[PDB]
Design a protein around this nucleic acid. Structure first.
Lengths: 61, 141, 129, 73, 149
RNA sequence: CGGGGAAUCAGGGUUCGAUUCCGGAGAGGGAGCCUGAGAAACGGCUACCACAUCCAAGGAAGGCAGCAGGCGCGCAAAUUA
RNA sequence: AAAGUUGCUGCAGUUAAAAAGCUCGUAGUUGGAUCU
RNA sequence: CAAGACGGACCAGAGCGAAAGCAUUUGCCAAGAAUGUUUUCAUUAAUCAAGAACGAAAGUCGGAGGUUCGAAGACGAUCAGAUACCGUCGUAGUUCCGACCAUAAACGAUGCCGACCGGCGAUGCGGCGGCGUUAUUCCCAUGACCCGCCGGGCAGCUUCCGG
RNA sequence: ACGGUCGAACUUGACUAUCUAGAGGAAGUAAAAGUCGGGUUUCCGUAGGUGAACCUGCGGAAGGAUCAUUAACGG
């Protein structure tokens, strides 16, 4: 929640806002870790394909 | 500084062998991984069956086409590429021909203008490329 | 900390001999240092020295003559057999004409020539030329 | 000294390495039979033993005479 | 160079070459021994006895006059303490620092200096067990530390 | 397979030693035996496991990491005198 | 073998590859004179 | 009036700490180097695999608090193509307490202990020896300066010691 | 023939490891000229912004080009 806090908010509201931000950050970190592992796996298999291109299926006849 | 005691022999030999493992030649010789990744399997020459003829482009500052031959080895089944050395010697190689193949000389390293080729053809159909090139022998088929 | 006081003595006299000084103060003093200095003195490499006597480990003041090029100690004190002494004097000495591997045998602290003469082997201490 | 009528001694020695011209400290453990006439034997005292026929699977020597430790009375 | 500090101090005593008793000192060996005995009955460490003898009675070195050092005189008579001087002092220092640490939990500097103190205590304990001054089964404990002092 | 040893090398060292001498191990794989002073033997026996020969279809006979030789294997190695 | 590019003899660790963020600490290694 | 924050100028190549680090006043608590000793012990030591404490900032859990700042984010300007710069607001955080992580250009890009090899005078601490000025001329010691010396440090300058 | 011992091997599940056929999935390569189209001193460690780079917040470095002034302070 992108809501600016005022001076009048007390407990059970500020605490709920803070834990909502914490849960959002936790899900965001899980998503970023998934993106990093997916990119690493795809780069590894594309490097394997480039190496297979280097070894064979490269020439004229 | 080095430990220069009288009872420090086992420390010195343990350190020497652990730092021996950090050499490139020693690790390539002794780890047993480059021996298993070597297509020849630590042999001087191998014998294969010709699959295809390839025109490999030369590395950039020299512009030419090298006539190589893609073969499949008999004893392990690996596919390798061997450069046919002289001019007009490619016409002696045919598909599904038995070839004796040796390396270039840099022991597993790509040599000179040809990228990704470790090997060169020595004999074609149980006669040498040199005798065919010089017209000393005829090849059967 | 301080170990092998003969190394300290030889390093001090070598540093002062290279600097062109006439006298060296070395501390502490031990008997093996005195025997080494006596061996060098009998071949005329250093000259007269005084043992200043404290009730502690003493001190030595040696007089210098410019006849010494390098004085050196070998650590650790390896076991030198009589057959292996030729390799040692090939490694350390600058020539077959001069230089001295000081070594201690059961007959005493002596040179390599005296060890050859008396047919005894010992532990290596130094060299000087 | 924890078996029934048998003890474990150790032999320390120096092993020479010729490439480095140096030594390394090695030890070997020996299970030796101790006769009941040698009582009040403490841990860490010198013993001289003599070779005999095999008495068990590992016991081969026999305690001949024991000299006490250096520090103790 | 100190063993737990990076300082390299040079401050120490320097005896003269003369081991002989000075002429002005009109004290015999038995009188010096009796003074040591009465200081021990008063209750002092041997270093404090030596300081009192040097400052007040003019006895420079007791082993130059009597021929024997203070702790050997106390041990031969039988008034030496059970645990030695420096070990007792280090254990008392450890007890004081530990009491401060149970007062103040967040004192990291006190914890580090306590670790250094116990390292010194263990070193002295090993040395005294090697020389058969302490029994081999003697052990310092954090819980059993204040009771020994 | 381990030594004697071999190649290289100022000195130190590094690498190799399947191979005619010595010792060990095994006769396709394990196992159990008979005889004999000596064998857990295989150019001795009894099995199971894996290959395999003669068949008249019931049965019998197997063991070349011995000397020649053959196949296969491989870059790689001799005469059925 | 050259390779003092495995350094025991006999290498290196400011800037070229490199010293642990820091201290304690068991095993290991080394350990001051001094006795004809 | 209140709220949390921060301890400027003095603040220096000055000091302390194993390092990260440490700057309002006072009191308490337990430590520490150095110096001085004609004190005591008498080798008790050095470096240290295993192991153990501390460890900037940022970050994560449970509590409190939110002054400033502020990543993200929201707008506003600016353009053949701008989606970084700039301005306003502002979330986590920045603060404190108790648990976690053990990472920095965590730098002297220079292991620790010990010895020797040129010189100089500034500074911090301690000690020693002193003519003098000062506490409105101080009646004695004591503090501040001034002149040398010694020990341990933070540093500097100079040198064809040699590398 | 009973029993015992040595015991090859056989059968059943688990852990594996190897040899060897495979419908399909995702790719790449050769053959299609086929269709439409300006900013930044150099960095380090963490966190965010779409993974990385990059930018920013915080804390660190120089591996970043020191000009000018500075003897009185007593009445």
């Amino acid at each position: 929640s992108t809501q600016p806090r005022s001076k009048n908010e007390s407990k059970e509201d500020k605490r709920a806002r803070k834990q909502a931000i914490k849960e959002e950050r936790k899900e965001r970190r899980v998503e970023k870790k998934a993106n990093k592992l997916a990119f690493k796996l795809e780069k590894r298999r594309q490097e394997k394909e480039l190496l297979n291109l280097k070894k064979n299926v490269e020439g004229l006849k | 500084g080095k430990c220069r005691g009288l009872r420090t022999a086992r420390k010195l030999r343990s350190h020497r062998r652990d730092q021996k493992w950090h050499d490139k030649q020693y690790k390539k010789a002794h780890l047993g991984t480059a021996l298993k990744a070597n297509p020849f399997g630590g042999a001087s020459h191998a014998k294969g069956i010709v699959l295809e003829k390839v025109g490999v482009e030369a590395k950039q500052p020299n512009s030419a086409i090298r006539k190589c031959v893609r073969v499949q080895l008999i004893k392990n089944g690996k596919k390798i590429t061997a450069f046919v050395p002289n001019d007009g010697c490619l016409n002696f190689i045919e598909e599904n021909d038995e070839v004796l193949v040796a390396g270039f000389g840099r022991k597993g390293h790509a040599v000179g203008d040809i990228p990704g080729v470790r090997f060169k053809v020595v004999k074609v159909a149980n006669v040498s490329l040199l005798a065919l090139y010089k017209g000393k022998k005829e090849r059967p088929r | 900390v301080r170990m092998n006081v003969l190394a300290d003595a030889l390093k001090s006299i070598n540093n002062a001999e290279k600097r062109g000084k006439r006298q060296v103060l070395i501390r502490p003093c031990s008997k093996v240092i005195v025997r080494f200095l006596t061996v060098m003195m009998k071949h005329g490499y250093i000259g007269e020295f005084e043992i200043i006597d404290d009730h502690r480990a003493g001190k030595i003041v040696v007089n210098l003559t410019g006849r010494l090029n390098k004085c050196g100690v070998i650590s650790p004190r390896f076991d030198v057999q009589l057959k292996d002494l030729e390799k040692w004097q090939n490694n350390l000495l600058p020539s077959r004409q001069f230089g001295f591997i000081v070594l201690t045998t059961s007959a005493g602290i002596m040179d390599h020539e005296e060890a050859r003469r008396k047919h005894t082997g010992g532990k290596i201490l130094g060299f000087f030329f | 000294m924890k078996m029934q009528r048998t003890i474990v001694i150790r032999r320390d020695y120096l092993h020479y390495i010729r490439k480095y011209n140096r030594f390394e400290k090695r030890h070997k453990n020996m299970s030796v039979h101790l006769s009941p006439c040698f009582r009040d034997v403490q841990i860490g005292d010198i013993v001289t033993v003599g070779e005999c026929r095999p008495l068990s699977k590992t016991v081969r020597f026999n305690v001949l005479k024991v000299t006490k430790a250096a520090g103790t009375k | 160079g100190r063993m737990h500090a990076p300082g390299k101090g040079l401050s120490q005593s320097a005896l003269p070459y003369r081991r002989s008793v000075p002429t002005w000192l009109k004290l015999t060996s038995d009188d010096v021994k009796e003074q040591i005995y009465k200081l021990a009955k008063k209750g002092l460490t041997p270093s404090q006895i030596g300081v009192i003898l040097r400052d007040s009675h003019g006895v420079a070195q007791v082993r130059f006059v009597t021929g024997n050092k203070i702790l050997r005189i106390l041990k031969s008579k039988g008034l030496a303490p059970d645990l030695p001087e420096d070990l007792y002092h280090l254990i008392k220092k450890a007890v004081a620092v530990r009491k401060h640490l149970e007062r103040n939990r967040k004192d990291k500097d006190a914890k580090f200096r306590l670790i250094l103190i116990e390292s010194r205590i263990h070193r002295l304990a090993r040395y005294y067990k090697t020389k058969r001054v302490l029994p081999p089964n003697w052990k310092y404990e954090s819980s059993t530390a204040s009771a020994l002092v």
